[PDB]
Write an enzyme that holds these catalytic residues in place. Structure first.
Site, PDB file in Angstrom:
ATOM      1  N   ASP A 104      32.956  77.423  45.530  1.00  0.00           N
ATOM      2  CA  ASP A 104      34.379  77.714  45.626  1.00  0.00           C
ATOM      3  C   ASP A 104      34.448  78.764  46.752  1.00  0.00           C
ATOM      4  O   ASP A 104      33.958  79.896  46.591  1.00  0.00           O
ATOM      5  CB  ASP A 104      34.857  78.312  44.282  1.00  0.00           C
ATOM      6  CG  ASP A 104      36.257  78.919  44.343  1.00  0.00           C
ATOM      7  OD1 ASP A 104      36.995  78.735  45.332  1.00  0.00           O
ATOM      8  OD2 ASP A 104      36.606  79.600  43.347  1.00  0.00           O
ATOM      9  N   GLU A 116      40.467  71.937  44.854  1.00  0.00           N
ATOM     10  CA  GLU A 116      40.266  72.955  43.836  1.00  0.00           C
ATOM     11  C   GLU A 116      40.790  72.528  42.470  1.00  0.00           C
ATOM     12  O   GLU A 116      40.077  72.663  41.488  1.00  0.00           O
ATOM     13  CB  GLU A 116      40.898  74.296  44.298  1.00  0.00           C
ATOM     14  CG  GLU A 116      40.102  74.905  45.464  1.00  0.00           C
ATOM     15  CD  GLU A 116      40.767  76.068  46.177  1.00  0.00           C
ATOM     16  OE1 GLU A 116      41.723  76.712  45.651  1.00  0.00           O
ATOM     17  OE2 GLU A 116      40.313  76.352  47.311  1.00  0.00           O
ATOM     18  N   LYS A 158      40.461  82.233  55.332  1.00  0.00           N
ATOM     19  CA  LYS A 158      40.982  80.966  54.802  1.00  0.00           C
ATOM     20  C   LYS A 158      42.438  80.696  55.181  1.00  0.00           C
ATOM     21  O   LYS A 158      42.898  79.552  55.099  1.00  0.00           O
ATOM     22  CB  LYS A 158      40.806  80.944  53.277  1.00  0.00           C
ATOM     23  CG  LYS A 158      41.076  79.596  52.610  1.00  0.00           C
ATOM     24  CD  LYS A 158      40.603  79.658  51.157  1.00  0.00           C
ATOM     25  CE  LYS A 158      40.854  78.371  50.395  1.00  0.00           C
ATOM     26  NZ  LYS A 158      40.222  78.463  49.045  1.00  0.00           N
ATOM     27  N   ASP A 217      46.909  77.867  38.644  1.00  0.00           N
ATOM     28  CA  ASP A 217      45.878  78.644  39.341  1.00  0.00           C
ATOM     29  C   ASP A 217      46.414  79.888  40.048  1.00  0.00           C
ATOM     30  O   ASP A 217      47.000  79.797  41.116  1.00  0.00           O
ATOM     31  CB  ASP A 217      45.213  77.714  40.355  1.00  0.00           C
ATOM     32  CG  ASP A 217      44.033  78.356  41.046  1.00  0.00           C
ATOM     33  OD1 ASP A 217      43.818  79.573  40.861  1.00  0.00           O
ATOM     34  OD2 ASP A 217      43.340  77.622  41.788  1.00  0.00           O
TER      35      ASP A 217
HETATM   36  K   LIG Z   1      37.743  81.933  44.124  1.00  0.00           K
HETATM   37  K   LIG Z   2      44.971  80.095  43.855  1.00  0.00           K
HETATM   38 MG   LIG Z   3      41.051  80.427  43.759  1.00  0.00          MG
END
Ligand SMILES: [K+]
Ligand SMILES: [K+]
Ligand SMILES: [Mg+2]
Ligand SMILES: Nc1ncnc2c1ncn2[C@@H]1O[C@H](COP(=O)(O)OP(=O)(O)O)[C@@H](O)[C@H]1O
Ligand SMILES: [Cl-]
Ligand SMILES: [Cl-]
Length: 378
Positions: free
Chosen positions: A7, A172, A68, A196
């Protein structure tokens, strides 16, 4: 290899490996199961992970984070131009592509976002290698469901630069569903909602799964809502408290604010399992110690609007997926911020008492599923 699952997060990265039918989330050299997605440059060295985040207070202009947010984007992208105004490090334009510019060993250098992320992936690769006692090459790396082709390509490239053979780039929310075995075939289709909330972004994704095939029905959220905003609310609260007690404003002292923020973030984690937390900072400003505490109730009030607001994207995602709340078969918590009890209460209440899938540390669920998928592809 075994192959590993990684991740590569906006704020923390995590690596896992599936062996003997079990996923092992791998602790780093400091015993931490997640590692800051930070890289720093100094007059003498390049620091990555915990080592880099531990000195951000003193080296803000050469400590890079949020790579990112740039990865796979063009310099003229509105998002990039907006984010640049908030970062302490410099972002420059190289033929239409963004690069972070820093000083290293007394010389100016610049790196593409995928090079910065490759450094974080190298660290995750080494963390896995130290645990396995073997070279690690194959990996599954995850990305947000909304990433486009360029962003996925640049993320894969970060892996290749780090010496990884990226078996596949997967979403994800899909990785999180796989962690809970929601990819197994049970006959009819199933609707899964992934909630999330990480350190910097909030993602709601509704997936429909059938015969092991995933369809992203809808996505919603806020790319600028995360745990760091809750820390900010606590920081402002304590700056006001210090001002009242000592008649001094610490706002313009960067190191003071940083030590306070760090203590607030740690206090916040404690509040997810206790109803009070203590904050004790020695010589916070001009030699004055700052010893105080905060209750879970106060922390919830300081963030009430932000917490309650996470429900709007949930309603929007449901509407866009053309599904009523009652049609969601499973709700999966992802992101460290979902460990906050008040957020769990809000979500469960919204879903009329439906239980939440939260047995896998939310900050590890994405890597956990990626590790499972990496073993399958291996
Ligand atoms: K993470
Ligand atoms: K997130
Ligand atoms: Mg995350
Ligand atoms: N026990 C906890 N209670 C509240 N927040 C937590 C807890 N553990 C981690 N967090 C928060 O989760 C956030 C970032 O981690 P996650 O692991 O969320 O990463 P990412 O943002 O890269 O997806 C941070 O804001 C962190 O403070
Ligand atoms: Cl480490
Ligand atoms: Cl409530």
């Amino acid at each position: 290899g075994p192959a590993v699952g990684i991740d590569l997060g906006s704020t923390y990265s995590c690596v896992g490996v599936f062996q003997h039918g079990k996923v092992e989330i791998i602790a780093n050299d400091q015993g931490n199961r997640t590692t800051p997605s930070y890289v720093a440059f100094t007059d003498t060295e390049r620091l990555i992970g915990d080592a880099a985040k531990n000195q951000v207070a003193m080296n803000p202009t050469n400590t890079v984070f949020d790579a990112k947010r740039l990865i796979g984007r063009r310099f003229d992208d509105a998002v990039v131009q907006s984010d640049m105004k908030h970062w302490p490090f410099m972002v420059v334009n190289d033929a239409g592509r963004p690069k972070v510019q820093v000083e290293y060993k007394g010389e100016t250098k610049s790196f593409y976002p995928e090079e910065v992320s490759s450094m974080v992936l190298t660290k995750m690769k080494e963390i896995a290698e130290a645990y396995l006692g073997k070279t690690v090459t194959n990996a599954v790396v995850t990305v947000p469901a909304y990433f486009n082709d360029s962003q996925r390509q640049a993320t894969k490239d970060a892996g290749t630069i780090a010496g990884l053979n990226v078996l596949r780039i997967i979403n994800e929310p899909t990785a999180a569903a796989i962690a809970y075995g929601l990819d197994k075939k049970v006959g009819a289709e199933r609707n899964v909602l992934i909630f999330d909330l990480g350190g910097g972004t909030f993602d709601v994704s509704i997936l429909t799964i059938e015969d092991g095939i995933f369809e992203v029905k809808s996505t919603a959220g806020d790319t600028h809502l995360g745990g760091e905003d809750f820390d900010n609310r606590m920081v402002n609260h304590f700056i006001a408290e210090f001002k009242r007690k000592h008649k001094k404003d610490i706002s313009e002292n960067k190191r003071a604010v940083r030590r306070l923020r760090t203590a607030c973030e740690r206090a916040k984690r404690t509040l997810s399992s206790s109803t009070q937390a203590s904050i004790e900072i020695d010589s916070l400003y001009e030699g004055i110690d700052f010893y105080t505490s905060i209750t879970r109730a106060r922390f919830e009030e300081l963030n009430a609007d932000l917490f309650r607001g996470t429900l709007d994207p949930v309603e929007k995602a449901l509407r866009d997926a053309k599904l009523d709340k009652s049609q969601i078969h499973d709700i999966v918590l992802v992101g460290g911020s979902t460990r906050i009890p008040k957020i769990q209460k809000l979500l469960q209440d919204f879903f009329n008492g439906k239980e939440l899938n939260k047995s896998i540390n939310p900050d590890e669920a994405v890597a956990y599923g990626a590790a499972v998928q990496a073993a399958i592809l291996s």
